[PDB]
Write a protein that binds this ligand. Structure first.
Ligand code: NA
Length: 156
């Protein structure tokens, strides 16, 4: 069995639009995603998610709601990514570009799936329907899913 590392992912989902961030530099640049990163020692997962949202988007929020969990496995990487997915309760400031991520609003009939992680085509529709989910995705590289599971759950 494999060890897992904790990550967060935050979707700022409003009634007609969603905020995504384009990764600007390094490997993986060019893909839109929610905001997030590794959880740090001592902080709750929710507090790590709030911290990453502020660092990557500039938005400071008091509370998030957990909507899902996705485990990622990559061929050749023994460590799994255990990603805890949150949506914002409300926001009260403007997003800002950080040298590493460019935030952008998308209308909910223009979700940029072709420029997102392939897994998001599966779980983001559940997120839009205000459902909770558990997913697992095994990737060859960045683009190819070899195996995956997705289930709606009542409790994350
Ligand atoms: Na990040």
């Amino acid at each position: 069995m494999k060890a897992s590392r904790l990550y967060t992912l935050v979707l700022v989902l409003q009634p007609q639009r969603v905020l995504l961030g384009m990764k600007k530099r390094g490997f993986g640049a060019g893909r839109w995603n929610g905001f997030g990163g590794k959880v740090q020692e001592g902080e709750t997962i929710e507090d790590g998610a709030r911290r990453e949202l502020q660092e990557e988007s500039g938005l400071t929020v008091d509370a998030l709601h957990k909507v899902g969990q996705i485990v990622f496995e990559f061929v050749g990487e023994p460590e799994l990514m255990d990603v805890h997915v949150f949506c914002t309760d409300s926001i009260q400031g403007t997003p800002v570009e950080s040298d590493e991520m460019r935030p952008c609003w998308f209308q909910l009939d223009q979700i940029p799936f072709k420029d997102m992680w392939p897994d998001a085509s599966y779980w983001f529709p559940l997120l839009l329907q205000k459902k909770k989910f558990h997913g697992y995705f095994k990737f060859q590289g960045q683009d190819t899913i070899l195996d995956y599971t997705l289930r709606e759950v009542d409790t994350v």
